[PDB]
Amino acid sequence: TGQTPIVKANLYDDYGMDNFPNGFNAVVAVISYTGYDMDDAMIINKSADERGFGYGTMYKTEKVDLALNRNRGDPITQHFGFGNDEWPKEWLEKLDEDGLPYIGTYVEEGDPICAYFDDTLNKTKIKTYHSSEPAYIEEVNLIGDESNKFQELQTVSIKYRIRRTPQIGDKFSSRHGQKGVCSRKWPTIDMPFSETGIQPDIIINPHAFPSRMTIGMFVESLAGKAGALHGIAQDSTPWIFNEDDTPADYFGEQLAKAGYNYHGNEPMYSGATGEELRADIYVGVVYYQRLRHMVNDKFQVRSTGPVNSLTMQPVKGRKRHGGIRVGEMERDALIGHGTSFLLQ
Amino acid sequence: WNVEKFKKDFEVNISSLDAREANFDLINIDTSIANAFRRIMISEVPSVAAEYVYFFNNTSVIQDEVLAHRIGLVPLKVDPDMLTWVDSNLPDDEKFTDENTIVLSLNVKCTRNPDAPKGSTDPKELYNNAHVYARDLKFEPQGRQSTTFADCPVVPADPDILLAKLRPGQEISLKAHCILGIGGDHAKFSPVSTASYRLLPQINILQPIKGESARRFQKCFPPGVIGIDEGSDEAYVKDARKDTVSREVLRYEEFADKVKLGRVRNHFIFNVESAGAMTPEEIFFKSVRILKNKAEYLKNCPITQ
Amino acid sequence: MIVPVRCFSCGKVVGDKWESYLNLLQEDELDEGTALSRLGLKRYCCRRMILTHVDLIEKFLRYNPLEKR
Amino acid sequence: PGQARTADFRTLERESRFINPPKDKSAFPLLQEAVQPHIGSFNALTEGPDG
């Protein structure tokens, strides 16, 4: 679910950017409060999350093509479907009669995604699902062949759907290069709450500002709140304002006409103690982008597990219980401590 | 302090009560307790919502898990007292009973309409059942429920919620199990479209302000907050309760010297909106009761060394 | 994609309000802030949800694999 | 009025366009203009007054 930005460059309309929503209008508070939001870490409201905020999906398409081995227009060894030998039967939980998976099926690592009968083996075999992240079957396409019919099914495309609810460690950013890593999904009864009775969707820490000087975010905060109040799109094209006509004055006047504080502050109360905080806190509406994972994040742990034949040392792996490397630098550190048993 | 001293001084004022929202003040109560009620109302007052969705088919453009999610956000008009809690240690067969669970079904196929007024944009006349609404969740009573819920069918509190859209040939087919839960677990169970409070504003003037200053001063606060008295011509506070605490006064130099802005620290203006299942007052009562049981359940637990 | 059911911050149901909001802008020829008020969206929390919704689904729906174009 | 360009949400214009994709030409010429060096240069392989 994307939203149009309340604070917009007019060119956003001219390039038809609403056809590809890229973010959403969050209620953002610039507050030190949770204690988990230092070092550019940020907070997402737990209830906001549970109500759909920032939810997203990933799709992966895999091609299963059992003509991969055959030497060019060769006799066909392997056909999608089941043989009449004896094979598991649990297989039919994932797979339809054709040997293709039923659409919609939940599929986790090791499950069948494909069944064919191999002639050279006189057995019915099975391509298995490999990701450590479970998914659902979206589309299964039968890619038939040309060169005039006669040929039976040899190529299939399976598209997996992977759920991405926002997690700890997911990255978020306003449109001002203020990128943050989700530190907590903070329970809404535990968030600060406004005189207006609102809890922030996102917390960004005031200490994230004096080194970066993204003063444009502060402007967006006022403009976005004023836009949400008056039902107004706000033009944020560069160079339309100047020193004799500042946006803080302009949007501030708009907030005052609405009935809120002219500087964009709002009174808030601690979710924990219940009491009014020391000063009014800076709150408003800022368009936020959720950043895709670029990294194979997933953790790993090994007690024991597979070792390599030559050295009898832990194999490299994760997906196969590989060990973690203590390399030369960590060796030197262990010597530097004088800790010979840790080294041993 | 003393519980009787509290009883004599505590006071409630009910500004507006309605089937959906309440506005009321708790006076001379400590912030720790007002806060408790507030937290409890949001996160610990049980409600009924769809929890498990069983799909048999969905060839719409909206993905299963997403559709399931929205159904879970639909506020069901069900009295939570009419249900007992599920024990989540039993297998699925034993888990769901007529005291445990409410079953909703949904069954739509979209077909093309022949009788469409040629050159039409509206999908109501172009397609049959293009739009799927919460009201389309049919309540299927199980066992004793045919009797128990005969006097109050299960209906979403907001019938016209848009749930899904379809085009010719696409169908949705699902059953949902709806059970007791609390907001702290997942926000779909929260019975409020929000309960919060504000402290009663205190605008105290540090010397008389009259004449053209009075008119000026008066306009720094919303209409009705500041009054100008006839006679002394001086300004006075009518009702702070209408003030939004914009601190606008503090901008104009002439006044920043003559006004302090504070709060009456123990006077809470509560606003409670119900998501639709129970009335506000019920939700607030239930919270005041919930707090008391915490204290009671604890007083009766043995303290293990 | 489709109207959200509840406002992300308020919790307030908002999903019953999309089709009417369009009819307000269209038929009654109101501005956006007047129409939002008429639907009961008071907090800027909630006004934001309907004001800035993009009914992207109506685009997705034009690709229907189950009918002869 | 007759002014400089202020911002609009274009709510009705947008949603109708989603439902009724134009039958004549795209509503965002600027977007086609941005890709012009690619389409143009490829087209140059076969057009021109000289084959």
């Binding site: 207006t196 009775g197 109040l229 008056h230 107004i232 033009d235 339309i240 304002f241 100047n242 004799d244 006509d245 302009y250 708009q254 006409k257 609405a258 009935g259 809120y260 | 500004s15 507006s16 506005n23 919060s196 504000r198 919303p222 209409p223 009705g224 309760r241 209408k242 003030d243 939004t244 203006i269 606003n271 | 802030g33 008020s37 | 002014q3 400089a4 202020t6």
Partner: peptide, 24 residues
């Protein structure tokens, strides 16, 4: 240079809880 145009006809769109537009 012309200033960025003021939007005409802006009214209160916020009230303390328990009040509404026509209480003003």
């Amino acid at each position: 240079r012309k200033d960025v145009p003021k939007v005409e006809g802006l009214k209160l769109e916020h009230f303390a809880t328990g009040y509404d537009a026509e209480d003003f």
